[PDB]
Design a protein around this ligand. Structure first.
Ligand SMILES: CCCCCCCCCCCCCCCCCCCC(=O)O[C@H](COC(=O)CCCCCCCCCCCCCC)COP(=O)(O)OCCN
Ligand SMILES: CCCCCCCCCCCCCCCCCCCC(=O)O[C@H](COC(=O)CCCCCCCCCCCCCC)COP(=O)(O)OCCN
Ligand SMILES: CCCCCCCCCCCCCCCCCCCC(=O)O[C@H](COC(=O)CCCCCCCCCCCCCC)COP(=O)(O)OCCN
Ligand SMILES: CCCCCCCCCCCCCCCCCCCC(=O)O[C@H](COC(=O)CCCCCCCCCCCCCC)COP(=O)(O)OCCN
Ligand SMILES: CC(C)CCC[C@@H](C)[C@H]1CC[C@H]2[C@@H]3CC=C4C[C@@H](O)CC[C@]4(C)[C@H]3CC[C@]12C
Ligand SMILES: CC(C)CCC[C@@H](C)[C@H]1CC[C@H]2[C@@H]3CC=C4C[C@@H](O)CC[C@]4(C)[C@H]3CC[C@]12C
Ligand SMILES: CC(C)CCC[C@@H](C)[C@H]1CC[C@H]2[C@@H]3CC=C4C[C@@H](O)CC[C@]4(C)[C@H]3CC[C@]12C
Ligand SMILES: CC(C)CCC[C@@H](C)[C@H]1CC[C@H]2[C@@H]3CC=C4C[C@@H](O)CC[C@]4(C)[C@H]3CC[C@]12C
Ligand SMILES: CC(C)CCC[C@@H](C)[C@H]1CC[C@H]2[C@@H]3CC=C4C[C@@H](O)CC[C@]4(C)[C@H]3CC[C@]12C
Ligand SMILES: CC(C)CCC[C@@H](C)[C@H]1CC[C@H]2[C@@H]3CC=C4C[C@@H](O)CC[C@]4(C)[C@H]3CC[C@]12C
Ligand SMILES: CC(C)CCC[C@@H](C)[C@H]1CC[C@H]2[C@@H]3CC=C4C[C@@H](O)CC[C@]4(C)[C@H]3CC[C@]12C
Ligand SMILES: CC(C)CCC[C@@H](C)[C@H]1CC[C@H]2[C@@H]3CC=C4C[C@@H](O)CC[C@]4(C)[C@H]3CC[C@]12C
Ligand SMILES: *[C@@H]1O[C@H](CO)[C@@H](O)[C@H](O)[C@H]1NC(C)=O
Ligand SMILES: *[C@@H]1O[C@H](CO)[C@@H](O)[C@H](O)[C@H]1NC(C)=O
Ligand SMILES: *[C@@H]1O[C@H](CO)[C@@H](O)[C@H](O)[C@H]1NC(C)=O
Ligand SMILES: *[C@@H]1O[C@H](CO)[C@@H](O)[C@H](O)[C@H]1NC(C)=O
Lengths: 344, 344, 344, 344
């Protein structure tokens, strides 16, 4: 039913499932905006496919040819099925709009499924190629941040009663390499191109005259070519073509609204803001150097992933509340850190 | 069946599922009134869609055109399907009420699903954008309250046998920022606007003459335009239109009753009452300062979320019972706190 | 099938599911009588809806109009569907009993579902508004009782080898407030009113002549108004109306039997008997004062909830067996308590 | 399918599910004979309902009226559905056996479901009212038996290298109260009465002439009353009536065989034999006094429940093997108990 389809595709965790494995425990591995874009671009065409053939919206068979009254039920069924299979056969049918509109009307669900698959492909390539590496690197970075926070609080407590910036060096090295950012931009660009092509196709499909679904059909090949009792042609109409056009314009609207989001996603350096690591600069055990901005490198992408999935880090949360309290400046950062006692 | 739909949509945890993740363990992340509003506004139109096409209420096909007796079964089926697809084609049909009523009668399930999706969108935006931040902040606040309660009871026990207000400073800082409250008000306002538009549409749909479902249909395009055996027109009726109107007025009543709730929700500062933190003011380790009221800021929203999901805090429950006992004034707050022995 | 519906709605845990959350572990949060009343009042109309359209009891379509023999199958189907949709349209049909009986016959499942939803609403309001508070308070009370029992047995063992009545003070304070009892009485009263209205409706529906299901139908609007081959009217009958009346009288009987139960529930103070706390009065560490009776206050409701869900408390069970043994008076209460050794 | 129904209702744990809660861990809370009686009396009529309308045994529709050849398919369908709905309407039909046989033939599944529900009601009342109390009491009794066994074995080991009969006093007190036994006897008696009424109904249904399923039907009310082309009456037959009678006699046989079991159950004191507590009399720490027999009191019912669900007690099992070995008398009870070393 329509409501069942809605529950499956919008109100359920459709493509929102976290990786089912212990390797990525709590790691999104995909930005929220990218996940939203993929979920829409994939589950919208599927939802429209399901809707267009819902038991309520669908009168019945997808084509009716209006055989003569003399024709029996199965003769008329032969006519309808023959014309359905003959939309491909150009000789059999003669339609003013041509044969491409008939092909599109017959295979619209296939085309929507193709677009959905093509849009799901780049996210899958990301999750299967560049996701494990960033997952491992980000897990190491979070562990290093937790360890340095613990060491700093232990030092503060000892004072009240190595020291090498490994994480900073690793981030600096990431500043050079750009394979991950190149893959990310390539997959986003392919998604954008697929969306644009889908918009072109949907606009063309919705621009039809709405009468191209009606085509003339001739069961006059073979032994029936010179038969007399059979009329030379029939009036066939492809039902649900109006529904297809409505859903196609809906998908076109959604995709044109979505494309600016993908374009904004492509410009990762601009998105790289609100320095996540700036909060850690007040730790004595952490060097006061952010050095993450203004670069078409994997460093900006790692900064984005950190700003996305750093809320799970207790040390980061503690430092963030310390920073927020520092806005008033009533107290002192080391005193607040010592009082917090948030090692684990 | 009707009962199955009821069990799925009203008697089950439809959209009442808690976040399936360890990050939010026991945190609602959504006020009870907001959750009720979203659940109604989403699962009502879906329930009505399912009901309108239930196997019992539905006589059968959604349109019957009453072809002549001479017409065969599949000729009549062609007529019915053609008219179903031709509700869009204005030339084919001539109805007194126009063609918009026919469009609405055909696509009412789609319109209800659209309203449900549009009403579910703002809650989803909230849960995916502003929910993680408030979850982390509120978890930190609850942990700080538990820790300060434990410290105060330990101090009392030591007396019987830092001290910095970090949580108060954090709340004071939240008094300034307003991004969360702005997002909350924006999503509530969008929900209200969607509800009002849905009410307008449902009132218009229910105001129809009830005879607009009957339209005249002409299969007279193409080779059949000059055919003689076919009548110039047919009498088609869209079945289930009365059911659609009944369910639409039901949804209109529900939404007009719900809109005052959304308006009351928009006025969060008025809702900010029954100070949750007032109970903690009797703790020696906690400063006697509430400072949370009369502000279009995130502080009021945080106060609401606390008053919602603070019952899970053992320290808060203990302080609440101490406060309630203090109404008589027979005993002493520190003595009762020491006797309680409710560290964990 | 009928047996499947029975298993789902009477032999299964339909609305008998305990709260699926760790917050309420073993707490009913709903009295047994109230749960029985809600389960009946909700799952009876749903069961009757399912039964009335069971594949065995149902001959087939819900209306047959007996078109002339000259009419084709789909002409007759058009007639039947038109009349089904025209039960609303007063002009189309002319029935002796009127049009309200036809509306009721068509929408009886909707009306039963409406009554079920309206009866499920007050229980849901209770469980979502007043259940968390009573759950927290009752959990605290049980924990306090366990702690005082442990302290008393420890004192007795020490003798053989604070002391403040916090729980008693909390109960005394609950004696004043009445918001929970007011909500309980309001929800019970609304349930009673809904049940009475349902009884009125079912009595009216069952009082019909049983021939109102037969109505005269006229497909004579539009181009067919002046058509000659079509008869001026048809004889239509709404099938399953007898089944609807039978099930409606069954529901009426059940609801009239149930209403006295709801009225008895409304009088909570009378139900407040068999003092649960009287057993704890023999503990040296517990003050000898019950002070819970004869009040339209939340104290009586809390006493009811205690008498309901106190069997899970080992200390209460031990004190109950001590009390029962004290009926003979052969031994001594402190000696029996010491011998029991039931700390945990 | 038939085999699926069999698997669900006889070969599966239909109504044999243990209470899904930690409160009753391993406690039957229902005697084996009572559970068997309830399972049969409930799942037999449901199984017969399912069988009577199985896709294999069922030819098709439940009534066929044999309309004239001139009648079209949907005219005949109208006739059949009209007569199906008119079995209630006495004026419409004229049958030699009357109208009650037709009512019974139409609503036999409803009557079987009613009997199943009425037979399931007393067991449900028991499980929801008197089951928690007996569960708590019996758990306490088993814990006391385990503790006294442990104390006795510890004393024996100490000798080789309070003392109050709390459980005996509790059982003696149970000797007085009779509310549980009264409820048990009342529910068993209601089950017996329901079974007898079901037997009466099934005997009456099976005693029919087998031709009462054939009734004369007249679609001659309304505009068709004076119509000429329609015959004055039709020959309608209610299919599956023979299957209903066969299954009804099967259920009658099962219920008459079952009723003696219920009568034997009612006489609980006679069932109270094979003293379970007699084995514990050899323990030095346990007083040598059974005092459980010859009483219409809850003590006999508790003895039955003990004899039912005491096999789970390791101490009871050890004492039972000691008793069995004592039949030969080769050894000594205290020596065997010391050698067993079965504390836990
Ligand atoms: C993806 C979207 C693809 C849509 C665009 C396809 C490009 C078609 C270009 C060739 C057109 C062509 O050969 O001319 C028409 C015949 O088309 C044809 O006979 C070819 C039809 C094109 C294939 C359409 C079917 C798509 C199936 C997708 C399946 C995906 C499933 C994946 C799981 C003639 O007619 P006319 O009207 O152009 O001219 C008639 C008067 N000059
Ligand atoms: C959402 C609710 C939308 C309802 C309001 C739509 C505004 C329509 C305004 C344009 C009307 C128009 O062009 O005029 C009518 C034709 O309408 C048309 O041909 C356009 C019909 C409007 C589209 C209705 C279909 C909604 C589909 C929703 C799908 C959602 C799915 C999402 C998953 C002519 O006829 P007349 O009677 O106005 O005048 C006839 C005598 N002057
Ligand atoms: C809930 C139970 C509601 C039943 C009582 C409704 C009160 C009806 C009062 C108005 C009656 C009225 O206008 O008069 C009749 C027309 O009724 C009408 O045309 C209005 C019919 C009333 C609506 C019945 C449909 C209930 C649908 C429930 C849907 C719930 C779904 C929720 C998920 C005329 O005929 P006459 O025989 O009275 O007089 C004919 C000779 N004077
Ligand atoms: C439960 C088993 C109930 C069976 C016994 C019912 C007692 C009927 C007594 C009244 C009989 C009566 O009024 O006389 C007959 C009409 O019966 C009637 O018109 C009344 C028929 C009785 C209702 C049968 C339908 C049972 C529905 C059970 C639904 C349960 C569902 C629960 C979920 C006339 O005809 P005649 O042959 O007696 O005399 C005809 C020549 N003098
Ligand atoms: C997904 C991508 C590939 C879709 C590409 C656009 C498709 C949908 C449409 C839009 C415009 C279309 C073209 C419009 C006009 C003509 C001229 C005609 O004589 C042959 C077909 C041809 C050449 C069409 C082929 C298909 C076409 C290119
Ligand atoms: C992503 C955005 C830009 C998509 C917007 C949809 C645009 C591309 C659509 C809307 C209407 C469409 C046109 C409608 C009709 C025709 C005439 C046909 O003989 C060739 C294709 C052509 C010229 C279409 C090309 C694509 C088109 C211009
Ligand atoms: C969800 C929102 C967009 C719904 C907006 C209201 C819709 C349902 C209805 C209510 C009143 C309607 C209008 C009423 C009157 C007219 C004048 C007519 O000559 C053209 C259509 C037009 C202009 C209608 C368009 C659709 C309309 C605006
Ligand atoms: C949220 C609340 C205010 C909704 C209440 C429903 C209101 C808006 C509905 C109920 C009846 C409706 C009117 C019914 C009939 C017409 C005539 C038509 O030619 C234009 C629209 C118009 C004028 C409708 C406008 C909207 C309307 C006034
Ligand atoms: C659930 C509640 C609202 C149901 C209320 C009772 C319903 C079922 C029935 C019972 C008696 C009925 C009334 C009986 C008589 C008349 C007089 C007639 O000229 C108009 C309808 C009217 C006024 C009926 C309206 C509907 C009615 C009130
Ligand atoms: C909860 C209890 C009291 C419900 C008992 C059912 C009662 C209320 C039912 C049973 C028969 C019913 C009556 C049957 C017939 C008519 C005639 C009609 O023109 C007006 C309604 C009226 C007068 C009904 C009113 C309600 C009624 C009296
Ligand atoms: C479950 C219980 C209520 C069933 C009771 C027995 C039912 C099945 C049957 C068995 C015998 C039957 C009775 C036999 C004879 C007559 C005399 C006739 O002129 C009216 C019906 C009446 C009075 C029957 C009513 C229904 C009846 C009582
Ligand atoms: C539990 C045991 C005793 C049930 C045995 C079934 C008995 C009660 C059945 C079997 C045959 C039945 C009888 C068959 C026929 C008739 C004639 C009818 O006009 C009145 C009922 C009457 C007289 C039935 C009464 C009940 C009956 C005697
Ligand atoms: C049909 O008859 C025509 C007559 O002109 C002939 O040319 C043609 O070959 C025939 N077709 C078949 C399939 O026999
Ligand atoms: C139908 O016949 C008419 C006669 O006036 C002619 O004008 C029209 O073109 C014909 N239509 C078709 C589709 O051949
Ligand atoms: C039907 O014919 C009658 C003849 O009196 C006329 O009044 C009426 O307008 C016609 N109806 C239609 C819909 O053409
Ligand atoms: C049918 O015709 C008879 C002729 O005697 C008449 O008495 C009766 O009222 C008519 N019935 C209807 C429903 O018009």
């Amino acid at each position: 039913a329509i409501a069942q389809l809605a529950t499956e595709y919008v109100f359920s965790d459709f493509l929102l499932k976290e990786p089912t494995e212990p390797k990525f425990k709590g790691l999104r591995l995909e930005l929220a905006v990218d996940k939203m874009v993929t979920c829409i671009a994939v589950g919208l065409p599927l939802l429209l496919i399901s809707l267009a053939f819902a038991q309520e919206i669908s009168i019945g068979t997808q084509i009716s040819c209006f055989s003569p009254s003399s024709f029996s039920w199965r003769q008329a069924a032969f006519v309808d099925s023959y014309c359905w299979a003959a939309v491909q056969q150009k000789n059999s049918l003669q339609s003013e709009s041509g044969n491409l509109p008939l092909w599109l009307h017959k295979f619209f669900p296939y085309i929507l499924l193709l677009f959905a698959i093509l849009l799901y492909l780049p996210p899958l390539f990301w999750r299967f190629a560049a996701a494990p590496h960033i997952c491992s690197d980000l897990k190491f970075i979070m562990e290093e941040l937790d360890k340095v926070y613990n060491r700093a609080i232990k030092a503060a407590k000892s004072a009240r009663d190595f020291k090498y910036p490994i994480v900073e060096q690793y981030l600096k090295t990431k500043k050079n390499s750009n394979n991950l950012i190149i893959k990310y931009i390539s997959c986003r660009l392919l998604t954008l191109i697929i969306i644009l092509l889908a918009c072109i196709y949907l606009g063309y499909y919705f621009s039809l005259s709405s009468l191209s679904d009606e085509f003339v059909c001739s069961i006059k090949s073979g032994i029936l070519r010179n038969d007399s009792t059979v009329p030379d042609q029939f009036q066939c109409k492809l039902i649900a073509v109006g529904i297809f056009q409505l859903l196609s314009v809906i998908n076109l609207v959604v995709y044109v609204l979505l494309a600016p989001v993908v374009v904004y996603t492509l410009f990762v350096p601009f998105r790289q803001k609100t320095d996540v690591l700036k909060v850690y600069e007040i730790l004595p055990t952490f060097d006061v150097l952010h050095f993450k901005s203004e670069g078409y490198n994997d460093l900006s992408l790692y900064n984005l992933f950190l700003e996305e999935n750093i809320s799970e880090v207790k040390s980061y949360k503690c430092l963030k509340v310390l920073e927020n309290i520092k806005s008033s400046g009533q107290g002192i950062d080391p005193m607040l850190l010592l009082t917090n006692l948030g090692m684990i």
